[PDB]
Design a protein around this ligand. Sequence first.
Ligand SMILES: [Mg+2]
Ligand SMILES: [Mg+2]
Lengths: 103, 103
Amino acid sequence: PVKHVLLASFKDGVSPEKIEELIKGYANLVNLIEPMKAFHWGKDVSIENLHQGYTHIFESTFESKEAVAEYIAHPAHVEFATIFLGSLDKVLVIDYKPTSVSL
Amino acid sequence: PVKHVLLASFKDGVSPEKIEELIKGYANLVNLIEPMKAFHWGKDVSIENLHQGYTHIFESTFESKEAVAEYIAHPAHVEFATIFLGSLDKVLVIDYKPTSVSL
Ligand SMILES: [Mg+2]
Ligand SMILES: [Mg+2]
């Protein structure tokens, strides 16, 4: 499954309540967008001080590379991204297929 | 489960074969370190050009925050980290508990 990951920090002024609604708004793309299967997230609680300032991590689970492809090409995603991104000071995205060391 | 994530790029000169052995060396910390349960990884295949230069993503799965705690305090991890980190131009770490939007 193509795992779609976004790491970011919320701009100055963004309230805890806005972030709550923003995250619920992002997770709602599972419902609005067929190719996006599951959505998980979390705040960072590391201890190594190597987080580069990023505070959250969002993980979405697609079935194929083409799925992430369409998702980006979805009008609901294009609309919502404006709302969310406007709340960020920085965004880091990664797309990978969980590879394992096995036989 | 405390998900431990590392994102990074391999310094100039690092060969594809070194990265292969380096990744196998990292995954081997599951065996050497009791608290570290599973390990998955992947190269980045995003399309948004928002990867900030990072090329890989490593995911480790611990059961609790204290588990990641001990892992960092493990001599085998301290030793191996020197080998791996010496191969990186930059490292970004995040520790989170996959939170879901549900009842
Ligand atoms: Mg869906
Ligand atoms: Mg273990």
